[PDB]
Amino acid sequence: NDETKRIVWTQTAGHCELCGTDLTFDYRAGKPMKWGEVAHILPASPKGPRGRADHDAEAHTNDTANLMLLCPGCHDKIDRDADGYPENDLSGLHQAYLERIRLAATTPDGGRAIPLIVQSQHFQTINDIPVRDLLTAMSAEGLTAFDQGIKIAFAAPGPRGRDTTYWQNVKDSVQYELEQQLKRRGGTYGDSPALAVVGLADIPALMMLGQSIGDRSKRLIFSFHREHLLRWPDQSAEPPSFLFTPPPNGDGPLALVLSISAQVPVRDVTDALPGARIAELSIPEPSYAMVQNRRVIHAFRDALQIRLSQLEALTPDPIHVFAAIPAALAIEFGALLTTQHQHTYLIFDRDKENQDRFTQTLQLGP
Amino acid sequence: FNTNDETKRIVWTQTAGHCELCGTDLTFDYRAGKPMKWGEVAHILPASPKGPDTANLMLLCPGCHDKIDRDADGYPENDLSGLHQAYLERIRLAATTPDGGRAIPLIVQSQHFQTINDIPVRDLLTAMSAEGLTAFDQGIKIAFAAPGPRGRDTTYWQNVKDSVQYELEQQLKRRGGTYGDSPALAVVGLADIPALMMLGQSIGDRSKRLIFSFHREHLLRWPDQSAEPPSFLFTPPPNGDGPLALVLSISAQVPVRDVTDALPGARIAELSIPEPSYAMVQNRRVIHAFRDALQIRLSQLEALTPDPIHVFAAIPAALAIEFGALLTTQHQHTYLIFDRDKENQDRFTQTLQLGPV
Amino acid sequence: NTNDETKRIVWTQTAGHCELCGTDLTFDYRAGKPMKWGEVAHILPASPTANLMLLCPGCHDKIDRDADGYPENDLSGLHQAYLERIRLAATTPDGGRAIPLIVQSQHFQTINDIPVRDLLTAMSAEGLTAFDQGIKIAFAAPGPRGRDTTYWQNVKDSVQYELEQQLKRRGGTYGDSPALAVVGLADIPALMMLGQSIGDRSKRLIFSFHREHLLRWPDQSAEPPSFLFTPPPNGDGPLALVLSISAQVPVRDVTDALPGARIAELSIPEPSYAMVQNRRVIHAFRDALQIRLSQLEALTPDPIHVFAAIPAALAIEFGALLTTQHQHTYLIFDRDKENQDRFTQTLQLGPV
Amino acid sequence: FNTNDETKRIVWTQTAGHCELCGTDLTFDYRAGKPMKWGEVAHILPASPKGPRGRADHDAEAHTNDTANLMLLCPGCHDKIDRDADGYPENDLSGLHQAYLERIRLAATTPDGGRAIPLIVQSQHFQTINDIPVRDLLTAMSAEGLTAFDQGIKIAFAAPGPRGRDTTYWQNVKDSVQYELEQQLKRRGGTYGDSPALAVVGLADIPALMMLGQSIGDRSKRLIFSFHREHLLRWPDQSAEPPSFLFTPPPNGDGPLALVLSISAQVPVRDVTDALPGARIAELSIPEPSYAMVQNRRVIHAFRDALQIRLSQLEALTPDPIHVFAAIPAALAIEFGALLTTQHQHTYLIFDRDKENQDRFTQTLQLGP
Ligand SMILES: Nc1nc2c(ncn2[C@@H]2O[C@@H]3COP(=O)(O)O[C@@H]4[C@H](O)[C@@H](COP(=O)(O)O[C@H]3[C@H]2O)O[C@H]4n2cnc3c(N)ncnc32)c(=O)[nH]1
């Protein structure tokens, strides 16, 4: 009936459940118009597409679970290739679509924030965080934005690897490009904008990023995850214990090893920094997947805050960092150095141009 | 504040029929069973006070409409335009979610399996569609290049990788959707394990990418989405100074003797599942679980020695792709990948080196 | 050696033309005769449905000389090259993805509001297709500092911010950024900054608000007027460029504002507010203007003082022209509604 | 009153099975993979005068099978034009309709001209967006019979940092031209062949385009295209005659030898002497320096011919390097660079306008051995 059709239009918000197009407006010529169709998953005729002689059309005809709002072209397609769009497939997509709309309508407003994606090109594969997945994880926490945000992609390493020019580009990406793009947004978000930031880039560059947004109010760190993408793996998980080994007595450069994503072999630290006094922060079971929720990041921040103070009093010389940590925790490491820790930190990193030996990269200081 | 019919239909639709202040579904009377009295169940109020369009018309239930202080002309006394727009933006994001499924189909096989079990694009497209992944052009169907007289050497494998990445980087240029994102990659492989690990090496694991797994019975559809991942049991390597060898007994139990045969003095560590099997990839979480368990142990093994880890794997094709994609960080430990030679009595031989020399 | 389904696919994918000589094979329908698909053309494997070609009877006689149903030479390269050409043409409509941009001063936004609907229908007529809501901007009013360098730099940042956030929305067949369809209605200096913001090195199409035709082009067939240049007088006074395009600027009002000005001038025979007859008029104004600015820029290193009576679209293009790496100093003057419409300096472009 | 099947089959054919308004392919469903016709034959003028765009003076019986009145549309583009007759008037649609059919016919009747690698090189040193559309290059290529196996290479230089176009910037440029570009051309190798033709269009730093040309002039089968402020990638005028290129020779002396190119604009001699005191200026120009002067590729050939021998001459006149001050379009900067690949083995110091130093010419790249 006309009432059920109006309900199909309402609960779908007038978009095609299969492609997402807005069926309430014509953006080419600018006229509000209803150009959608209410499609039947199960046909009245059991000889039609997805027709089953063992089906009660007396009930499903008005069941909002048998009725999808589809643009004209998607309806043509599901009805002309029933083998390719079986009932089970379409009913699944149908309920999932309605759920996301309900969840969006019932999410309490949490405020505004600037989406910020920072990604490098130093991997030997594509490295691309989808903007949509960051905006979706923000929206699940009530956060919205006026624009799709800032997305900074570092220049790729040249023929000499990650050389001086490369690390200069990184500095210009963090300290100049990001600043300019944030300044261009002042008139819109104001002078107290929250930063919804996710990063997947060189560890030293994420630390530098963190230090340059560390004095920013309302910093929400998100995380790219190999299984869950921008979704938090498990909101109910407990942070691990961040085990700490203080460094041994003596002179020699003080090295801070962080074994969070993996166990950093001591033999690689002393190879690069002979005579190193190794202090180590680790978790019981190092793992790439350990960033289960933001409380894990806060817990890492809390544990590191205390150890950096201890180490900064155990030496007058720079602290040499050898880190195997997730990206989100590299940002947070850097954020601790913005005003709370003014000691000098020299960041070593794996060097593909040197058989995976650690070599010095950026220096982070006051 | 009064409005016309078309105006209310637009406000109800663009709000999904919920109160923008408390999120209550104002289609309640419909779900109960009573006829819908759209007019009495909700007050459509402008979002902003009077200050000298349907985008600034809100939908409020009567409760919230009575709590909002209004002036005599029906406008809100305080400015609700910020929450109104936020609420609309959250609905748009959800309603546009289907276009976040733009995807590239990728089928990679060996010249052999393209003659044996040639996977058709249609099998992948329907499995993709089922999960909301929507191709927009012909899929990429690739066959690994047969080796010339130089063989499968470093240059050969570098040309495979180069060839696979060229092919998809051109399709990843085809940005689209609401925000201009690159499409997702939907990939399935069927080739020898080393060649599959090179597929993972080419694609990585730092993008929106969904692996699929060929299965004769289900084709590229998941056998059982509800199945829980199996436990991945680990036997630590023995003490000694011999070459370190990681054995993966996932599809089957690799005879220890076959490993010692190909690698004299091999200290064997082994990840395995309680009941190895060819059909253990019941869904995608199985693949993720394998990655997590594997990397936890590779962390332990790489720290044991600077010398190469020798890999002897009886693992499903999908897991061989993920294994290759795992080892695409900047950090690289030397891995020497062994494969059974079907032309010489299934003896393990060294096919592929990964990482430093 | 083909079934009706295959012939239909080959006929559609090729647009009914012979893949070797390009003669139209739908001629029967065109003249008025019944369409005999299988008599006017032959389908043939390209090498000795994606690998079948459509050939006219003649070309078939020249390829299949042994009438064995296959060619004597591998024609796969020409066949596939042919289908690509067809595909690029058939998908050209998606090359029109576009962003509506309406930029007005707060004054014109109230007295002469341009509706998005007017721009969109002008765009659609030319094959430009918006996919989301249009951008509608109003120039922010200054503060007590007035229109200092900071004000104009902030106008530019806010315009570029919104502009670049929508140029991220790539799409179509090749992931191209969408085209910018922009119309402006504001004071001349503020329109020059809109031009400084958008540039002229991207797929961008200016539209023009016309007092009579609104955002539609008065006469797509109109030829552009000749642009007339009076070189400046010899001397050592400040250099001025008067643009009398929509009206004659009185030389006395230039010198009153710029004592001792050596006035060069660009104009048209019949200055008129309605002269923006089509987009070719805007292009022709740029070409003439740049040819003379090159002359004027080579005269002196000192700035060029600009007094312009020009349509709004020509003010944007003026601004867009001056976005190369090279930058001569220009001091743009505009009539102050407070000071009896006296030309005042309002905007500086380029070096101090 | 109802279009017949013969005419519907004609509409499908003359449109190659795509929507004349959005370009979607209406012969296949790429999501599930099944070939299918899902396009509709839409009528611009309806049989009923009350229909969308209905006219009373319209002889319906004499246009139901008139392909000039029938478009192939996707189901959604059909709902829209019939639900907003005012926003899709008869003349708008009719024009879009005939233009579509014309592009199809020009394609179908273009003689093949072999393959080429599409190549776009653009910088980010302007204060505005700078983006050459990929489709416009491919359409320019197709117009000359050239097709490609992929959409080609598109190289966007790193933007200048906070210090302007400093040493880091030009190192990035060199890396983009000499390393990244070579890398991408290698990976394509095998899809095109040993020595394929290049369809190259550039819009980047004048010194970078010269370096680009030098790196590819040794390559054979270079087809240069040009971005034009009015015509985009379409050649402004294929019939226009090349301009007269005017060469003023340098005076004998000891000053440094400067080559001034006044083509897009007149380079002031003050700015050359400011940066290079006592320069000996040899200038190549045209009667009316203009940004729009790249009317066709013959203009580019004529600029090449006008300096191919001049550079040899100038090289003998001085042992020191030749100092270049060029106001030229982006396509001639690529051509200038190609001339220097090996034909002219000599050091060339390329000066360019420095936004940091108040538009003064300052040295940037060095080109030669
Ligand atoms: N296994 C191991 N890794 C070591 C060792 N010494 C240094 N490392 C480095 O630690 C990082 C571990 O990877 P991650 O995924 O946990 O975190 C990285 C890191 O925050 C950032 C940059 O990556 P990279 O330069 O490879 O640093 C990698 C390793 O070299 O990005 C994160 N990241 C990279 N890829 C992903 C991804 N797919 N998803 C999420 N985050 C990612 C050592 O001894 N052993």
Ligand SMILES: Nc1nc2c(ncn2[C@@H]2O[C@@H]3COP(=O)(O)O[C@@H]4[C@H](O)[C@@H](COP(=O)(O)O[C@H]3[C@H]2O)O[C@H]4n2cnc3c(N)ncnc32)c(=O)[nH]1
């Ligand atoms: N039982 C057993 N297998 C061993 C042992 N040592 C090594 N192997 C190898 O493990 C693989 C197990 O087969 P799979 O189907 O689980 O996975 C294969 C593999 O990922 C890839 C190539 O196959 P192959 O070279 O035979 O490697 C096979 C075995 O030799 O493709 C997968 N694959 C092959 N055929 C199919 C198929 N029909 N369907 C799905 N996946 C397939 C050892 O000791 N024992």
Ligand SMILES: Nc1nc2c(ncn2[C@@H]2O[C@@H]3COP(=O)(O)O[C@@H]4[C@H](O)[C@@H](COP(=O)(O)O[C@H]3[C@H]2O)O[C@H]4n2cnc3c(N)ncnc32)c(=O)[nH]1
């Ligand atoms: N007659 C005359 N005009 C002079 C003189 N010195 C300066 N001017 C300015 O030239 C412009 C002429 O009007 P226009 O419509 O051709 O162009 C204006 C201009 O581009 C922009 C802002 O308007 P304004 O600040 O008045 O500049 C007006 C004049 O002051 O907007 C354009 N514009 C204004 N109204 C409309 C409209 N209704 N439709 C289209 N464009 C409009 C001088 O000596 N003499």
Ligand SMILES: Nc1nc2c(ncn2[C@@H]2O[C@@H]3COP(=O)(O)O[C@@H]4[C@H](O)[C@@H](COP(=O)(O)O[C@H]3[C@H]2O)O[C@H]4n2cnc3c(N)ncnc32)c(=O)[nH]1
């Ligand atoms: N007017 C003028 N320009 C001078 C002078 N001395 C040096 N120049 C430089 O010459 C070029 C003139 O502009 P163009 O468009 O004719 O050529 C440029 C050039 O080939 C390349 C990079 O631009 P840029 O670094 O600004 O060089 C500009 C100028 O600084 O790209 C070309 N280019 C730039 N913008 C476009 C565009 N929109 N469309 C097409 N090509 C473009 C001097 O005295 N006067």
Ligand SMILES: [Mg+2]
């Ligand atoms: Mg149906």
Ligand SMILES: [Mg+2]
């Ligand atoms: Mg239909």
Ligand SMILES: [Mg+2]
């Ligand atoms: Mg023959």
Ligand SMILES: [Mg+2]
């Ligand atoms: Mg119709």
Ligand SMILES: [Mg+2]
């Ligand atoms: Mg329809």
Ligand SMILES: [Zn+2]
């Ligand atoms: Zn749809």
Ligand SMILES: [Zn+2]
């Ligand atoms: Zn409420």
Ligand SMILES: [Zn+2]
């Ligand atoms: Zn022919």
Ligand SMILES: [Zn+2]
């Ligand atoms: Zn369409």
